[PDB]
Amino acid sequence: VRLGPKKPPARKGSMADVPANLMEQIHGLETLFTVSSEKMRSIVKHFISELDKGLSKKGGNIPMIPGWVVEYPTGKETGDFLALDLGGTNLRVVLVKLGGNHDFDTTQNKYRLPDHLRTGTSEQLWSFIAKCLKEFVDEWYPDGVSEPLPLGFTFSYPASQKKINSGVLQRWTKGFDIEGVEGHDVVPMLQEQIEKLNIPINVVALINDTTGTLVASLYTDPQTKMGIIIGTGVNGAYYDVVSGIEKLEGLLPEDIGPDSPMAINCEYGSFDNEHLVLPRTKYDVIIDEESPRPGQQAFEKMTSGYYLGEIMRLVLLDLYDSGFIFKDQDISKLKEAYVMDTSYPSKIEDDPFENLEDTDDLFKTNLNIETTVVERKLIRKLAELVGTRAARLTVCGVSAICDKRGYKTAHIAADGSVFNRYPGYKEKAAQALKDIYNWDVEKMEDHPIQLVAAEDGSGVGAAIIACLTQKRLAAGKSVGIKGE
Amino acid sequence: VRLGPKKPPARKGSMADVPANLMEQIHGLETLFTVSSEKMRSIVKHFISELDKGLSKKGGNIPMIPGWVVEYPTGKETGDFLALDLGGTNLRVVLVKLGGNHDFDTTQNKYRLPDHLRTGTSEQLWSFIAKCLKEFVDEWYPDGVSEPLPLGFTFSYPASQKKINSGVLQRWTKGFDIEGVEGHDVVPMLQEQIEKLNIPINVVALINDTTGTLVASLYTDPQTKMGIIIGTGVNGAYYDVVSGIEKLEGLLPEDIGPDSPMAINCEYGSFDNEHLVLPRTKYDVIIDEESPRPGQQAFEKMTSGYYLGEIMRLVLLDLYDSGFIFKDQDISKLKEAYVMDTSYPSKIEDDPFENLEDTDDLFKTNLNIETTVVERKLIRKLAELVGTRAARLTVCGVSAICDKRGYKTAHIAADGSVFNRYPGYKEKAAQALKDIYNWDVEKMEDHPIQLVAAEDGSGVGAAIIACLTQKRLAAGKSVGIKGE
Helix, strand or coil, rough: CCCCCCCCCCCCCCCCCCCHHHHHHHHHHHHHHHCHHHHHHHEEEEEEEHHHHHHCCCCCCCCCCCCCCCCCCCCCCCCEEEEEEECEEEEEEEEEEEECCCCEEEEEEEEEECHHHHCHHHHHHHHHHHHHHHHHHHHHHHCCCCEEEEEEEECCCCEECCCCCCCCCCCCCCCCCCCCCHHHHHHHHHHHHHHCCCCCCCEEEEEHHHHHHHHHHHHHHEEEEEEEEEECCCCEEEEEHHHHHHHHCCCCCCCCCCCEEEEEECCCCCCCCCCCCCCCHHHHHHHHHHCCCCCHHHHHHHHHHHHHHHHHHHHHHHHHHHHCCCCCCCHHHHHHCCCCCHHHHHHHHHHCCCCHHHHHHHHHHHHHHCCCHHHHHHHHHHHHHHHHHHHHHHHHHHHHHHHHHCCCEEEEEECCHHHHCCCCHHHHHHHHHHHHHHHCCHHHHHEEEEHHHHHHHEEEEEEHHHHHHHHHHHHCCCCCCCCC | CCCCCCCCCCCCCCCCCCCCCHHHHHHHHHHHHHCCCHHHHHHHHHHHHHHHHCCCCCCCCCCECCCCCCCCCCCCCEEEEEEEEEEEEEEEEEEEECCCCCEEEEEEEEECCCCCHHHCCHHHHHHHHHHHHHHHHHHCCCCCCCCCEEEHHHHHCCCECCCCCCEEECCCCCCCCCCCCCCCCCHHHHHHHHHHHCCCCEEEEEEHHHHHHEEEEEEHHEEEEEEEEEEEEEECCCCCCCCHHHCCCCCCCCCCCCCCEEEEEEEEHCCCCCCCCCCHHHHHHHHHHHCCCCCCCCCHHHHHHHHHHHHHHHHHHHHHHCCCCCCCCCCCCHHHHCCCHHHHHHHHHHHHCCCCCHHHHHHHHCCCCCCCCCHHHHHHHHHHHHHHHHHHHHHHHHHHHHHCCCCCEEEEEEHHHHHHHCHHHHHHHHHHHHHHHCCCCCCCCHCCCEECCCHHHHHHHHHHHHHHHHHHHHHCCCCEECCC
């Protein structure tokens, strides 16, 4: 039925019928968008320097935020832990029972926030969350608990913390506008409503979701060396060592000593805001100039899935202006910024046909543009270049973290819409790693450093970080700066 | 992010808070929609009697159509062969190179049919298809070929054939309405257009796609015993033996002997149109009575994914009318036939939350109905019952074919949107085979009869049947009834 259920083979992609003038333009696009293996190596050297610089006292464009997880999960932890994952529209409550053999069981609910909460009072927001937590606990522990359930709170809003059981909101985003919260620690605000309702929970950790991706995945997969999100936003987290963090010198208690692990939330979207190494094209420059913050987020702009259609849009417009393509078409829909989302390069890269009929129907239907087959062949080459460049640049952050820490082998626990859904992304990223290291290895499943699907960072990961944190808190081991 | 990239585990699905009166209706639904293994076995006995009846001279509700493939592919076939698949919106052209080691390579194009084709003239249709084939051959064979390319034509319209290289259209479907084709053999009509354009192709076979699914999958997977489609429509194909086909007695040449294999396209959607054996409910009766052809396609109506939402819509409306659910809601959407497509039970079965928030959002957003959590638990149970009943009744068809032919081990090469995408469908069907055979086996890979993904029947399958047929035609071996 249709093409049958199995993944169609890649199209042959003959260029024999493409006229010389378009072939010249395609080869021009290859020089603008191709990232050489040696170029990746060059970017990784700079990236390692900038990781180091973000951990220094002077700091750098990469935040390199300490995540206050100062131990590795062993996979042998047991017990019941909660996670709260607060988004802009919904929250999720997860009960994780850790089985102590790299395994876990989950029970989870999701609650839609009423639309007035976002602009309501502080107390009503924390009240709503505590009400959801009471309803969930009352059901799953109808006879109560012997000890309070430790909870890990994924709060992925700009926030700072001097210890793991704290989060001082810096500024509301994802929609919110509530008074009396910016500049305050949210952990006591949530805990106060929890205690007001006599719910047996202690909020012991506040985290970024990518730190949670790292930790949940290392609990299940002991080869895990990094958590990476490759989607609309981008981020990476990994464990560095305290002796490598100059900006914490003089701030730590003796029980977070120089050889302690320390999870880092890199927030590396701002890598190369100086615009030195990343291969920004005139199209990337336009994107940046037209973005909400020109000059910010350089690495994110170069690797996020959000921009991949817009790159194509601007290139196609440039080709149309130069008189090469769409000569007798009405291209008005193409002039709309972001009209081409990530589905465009994805559907074009997935097209299994030599005549590129999926790509034909996509342009005719969505943009009112008729194409010749050789135009579609240029379009398909361009989509391939854009998806492949994004993968090759994302793996530079992977290779920089691995080389910084001396990981010769690693599983890189990955999540995000580009990793999970972009066509051929896993193949592109594996070939990119192989190109960087020049490995003599036949199959991608045998690569020394390889991306694998992550465990749930904002749910499971927050619950396992709560476990690790409660173990320290109970023993009186520090999980923050001296005195905090 | 979200719930992380891996399939969430199944929800716990506690029924502890469901009031007694609603819990009685839930258990009533479970009794009504569960198909016991004892009932599966009984259905299979009647299904086998009906397969035998369809092959008899007097015939029966199951067509049991001889497919005129009278040999098994060995996997040693080599060479270049074409397939054409004509659907209602497009046609697909496929070049299949057979490697001689159960292996093949494909090169394919897809041509969208001009708007006017479906209602234009026969000449317009066959001339369009020939033009597409000319453009395709002229490209992949620019210096021509040393022998004409044999072509398999997947023409999945009601048609009769007295030999494989023929198809006399009975009735257009899929929106076609072309004068001067019904009651005529379409093979010479296509061949004439190919010859007018001097394209080096011989149309050697016309097939139903399910016959293609059987043969392509047996070429690649020597354990294949059946091809099965579980989608919007349902069908199954397998090899019987000529001595087992009474309705061909007296009609065959000596070289299609009593021991020859014969592929059968069952068209078993009409099994039990008498409505005596399948466990219909009043809801299935309403679906049949309200359908375009009441009393037809009984087995299709009980196993196709097309009706799974509509079964739920009717059950839910019945429970509302009875006063049990949605009291005080505006249920007018529930009153629209086919408002609930297959995505409803699919999304509901995938909902990972104990409070069924995905199901809550689906009902509010799409149906304008607010639910209590206990209503959603009834809705979820109903979706599981409906998907599970469909899987177990499809497995009765599989088990009837295996038991008819004495297959105690088999790969069942499966395709269609239900098999490929319906949540948990592969585990539902594997459990159903274990139940009917009462196998003492823990792991699915140890199951002696298993559904596996099919190879492409309408492309690769048609091309492989062209290959088998060409070898016979060249040698003078028959592929049809005497004299045809």
